[PDB]
Amino acid sequence: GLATILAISTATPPNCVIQADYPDYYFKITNSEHMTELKEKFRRLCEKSMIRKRHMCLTEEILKANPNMCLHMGTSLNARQDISLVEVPKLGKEAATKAIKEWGQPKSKITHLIFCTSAGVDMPGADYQLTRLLGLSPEVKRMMIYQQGCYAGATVLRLAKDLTENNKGSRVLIVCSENTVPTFRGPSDTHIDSLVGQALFADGAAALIVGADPDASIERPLYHIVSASQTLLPDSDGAIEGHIREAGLTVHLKKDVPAFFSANIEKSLVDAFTPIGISDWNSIFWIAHPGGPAILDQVEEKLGLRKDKLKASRHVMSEFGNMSSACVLFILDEMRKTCLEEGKATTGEGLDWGVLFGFGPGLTVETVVLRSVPIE
Amino acid sequence: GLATILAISTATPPNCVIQADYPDYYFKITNSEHMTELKEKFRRLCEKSMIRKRHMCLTEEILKANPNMCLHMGTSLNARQDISLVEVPKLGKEAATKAIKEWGQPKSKITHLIFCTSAGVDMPGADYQLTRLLGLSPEVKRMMIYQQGCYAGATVLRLAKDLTENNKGSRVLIVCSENTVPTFRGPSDTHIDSLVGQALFADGAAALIVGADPDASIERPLYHIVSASQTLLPDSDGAIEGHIREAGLTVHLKKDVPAFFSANIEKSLVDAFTPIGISDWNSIFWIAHPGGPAILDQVEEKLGLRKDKLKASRHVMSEFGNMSSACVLFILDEMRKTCLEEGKATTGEGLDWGVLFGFGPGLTVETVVLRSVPIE
Ligand SMILES: CNc1ccccc1C(=O)SCCNC(=O)CCNC(=O)[C@H](O)C(C)(C)COP(=O)(O)OP(=O)(O)OC[C@H]1O[C@@H](n2cnc3c(N)ncnc32)[C@H](O)[C@@H]1OP(=O)(O)O
Ligand SMILES: CNc1ccccc1C(=O)SCCNC(=O)CCNC(=O)[C@H](O)C(C)(C)COP(=O)(O)OP(=O)(O)OC[C@H]1O[C@@H](n2cnc3c(N)ncnc32)[C@H](O)[C@@H]1OP(=O)(O)O
């Protein structure tokens, strides 16, 4: 009996942010409307982001109160920490509440808790904050995944698979919770790649229950975590870097990070699926972290995916933005849900085998082979 | 076949710091020698710390260059980050190098890597830095445990047990690496409990190889990780807290944290050892995080331990200080080693069953049941 995903649920801050209105509002509130060339640069980024809206607990009101989070390098870590460390477990609890409610079991049957965030660290961490908030057993075995960035959505299923398979009867609550409080800053023309960050990053929390050997009479499998791998890309050092600094979380990118992922992604597909005997990347279903459209576009190209292998992935991208570790989890709610409503054979867009990708610092590719479960 | 510890090794910065000379040097270099009452307070703390020496990569030379790390709340996170993020994986590599060398297998047989530190976070983290430094397979499955404080020495064996038992043929490199770069500050009489921090915290790196089903002909078991539990202490909220701030890692303690651990520790001993049928806490061997002497003293009292159940633990305490997640690991090297040299029946001070405790924020108690292996 494999680690089986029994329930999923998501939560986002109330404040919707329309990407069409963002380049004006951003350069208004960062008092930069005279970098007209940079403003148009950022307008192009936002239009090609393929993100309709984003959710952000960070509002205009909070930003007016903290001017230094509106500068590019404003001394602002404390102010961000003060917001973010409350907001991370809070918005994680909203999602967790609903995921338990869907799972249909008392919270005292949750033996393990995996919490994951890059929006700020603390001692004790958001694992403790969330355990106190939900009222879980004081004996829950917790794993606190801090600052692992955008591949960490698959990390948390790679973690949970081992936790749950080596501990008969166990049930893991996973909570990913992410926000832009530590990364929001004003623009700088010595630092264009931070504009890339400002066009993509959103807030979002996702929660799962994972357990092996599900009880057929009281819980409903959605996916089976078959395998999970992790690899570093050759010659990719420095491509993504993020430092926690007196100015918050500074994020420094390279232009050809979309090229590193596309070039190398088949290596991971071959490593994972060839021993299974699967070689046609269109014959599987697809979850891929929408880090940027350029990542997903180029993997679609290099591999020859039909125009809609990545529908669910790009859909969550446009409706929510880059919510770091949560995206891959949101995408599985969308596709699990949408299949049922459109009545496809399996939660895997009718297909049997699936792949789930996380991309982030290293550069790192997390490769999770899934199995769908039938519908109706 | 249980998760078996195959090899251990330790490393420390060159700069030895004699606790007898520390209260003068500390108040000299923090330019505070006129808080004569506070200086004597700190002199009492240091004398009762039962710490002979500590190792610190942070030297007088580095401290003279960074005056703001000598103030109590000096804006200093960047300067500390700049030191610490190099030093963490570096000193972890020294230890890891030797642990592989003792294990007697090529580094390409290391399938997993668990890295653990509270001395500073980064993106990518010290898992990546250390993987690049040692030259491990790019496919090593990494778990990056950030900012889990002083119980994290047992966290990393609780993690490794599941990793290695659910992945036939696997071999886990654990590296804990800790230092006082982010926590060193000058004294403050509104903040006495930070003086407690200054009397105890040391630098130290520890590395292990953990694997289930060892090959009898080429690796030598030292311990078996039987079980691992984690619990929060009732009414203990706020007792230990640490925030990563513009001034570095601020650490705020409560006076009765030694009382929380002693009062509750038997709960965990009963939970772990009663199903095994073991009820005499003197009949087992003992590793306990020497967070402060008051912790170990009071657990010795509340439970009735003979005067030398805690010898190895207090020994590493006096010779090295509070090195956070590493201490519990150093203690297992000491006791494993010393038994052999004094020729006792088993690596467990001649005993069969053992306990290993981690203590830190939450408040959190990590309880790991070990098994010794025979000697000669
Ligand atoms: C630490 N991380 C995190 C932490 C927490 C949460 C999340 C994360 C992360 O998210 S992890 C990060 C993973 N995602 C990515 O790295 C994004 C990959 N890129 C794309 O997805 C698309 O490319 C865009 C950006 C939508 C542009 O759209 P598009 O127009 O199609 O691209 P173009 O190259 O044609 O031109 C676009 C114009 O912007 C310029 N420029 C674009 N890129 C970069 C870049 N790197 N560095 C420096 N400059 C750049 C470029 O020079 C050009 O100006 P010009 O020089 O041309 O004037
Ligand atoms: C985030 N964490 C980390 C992160 C990275 C790495 C490591 C960590 C950690 O390490 S996690 C932390 C786990 N360890 C502990 O919490 C230590 C437990 N305590 C002891 O081990 C012993 O007690 C001492 C301290 C040696 C004193 O020795 P001792 O003399 O025997 O104790 P006393 O109470 O008799 O008097 C001692 C004099 O200092 C005063 N005072 C002592 N304590 C405290 C305290 N809390 N808070 C406020 N004031 C205190 C006290 O009022 C008295 O002054 P007076 O008021 O009397 O003048």
TrEMBL record, chains A, B:
Belongs to the thiolase-like superfamily. Chalcone/stilbene synthases family. Pfam families: Chal_sti_synt_C, Chal_sti_synt_N. The keyword Transferase applies. CoA binds at residues 41, 253, 291, 294. The modification Cysteine sulfenic acid (-SOH) is found at residue 57. It catalyses: N-methylanthraniloyl-CoA + 3 malonyl-CoA + 3 H(+) = 1,3-dihydroxy-N-methylacridone + 3 CO2 + 4 CoA + H2O. Residues 1-214 form the Chalcone/stilbene synthase N-terminal domain. The modification Cysteine sulfinic acid (-SO2H) is found at residue 150. CDD domains: CHS_like. GO terms for cellular component: endoplasmic reticulum. This is Type III polyketide synthase. Residues 225-374 form the Chalcone/stilbene synthase C-terminal domain. GO terms for biological process: polyketide biosynthetic process. GO terms for molecular function: acridone synthase activity. Keywords: Acyltransferase, Transferase. It comes from Aegle marmelos. The active site is at 150 (acyl-thioester intermediate). The keyword Disulfide bond does not apply.
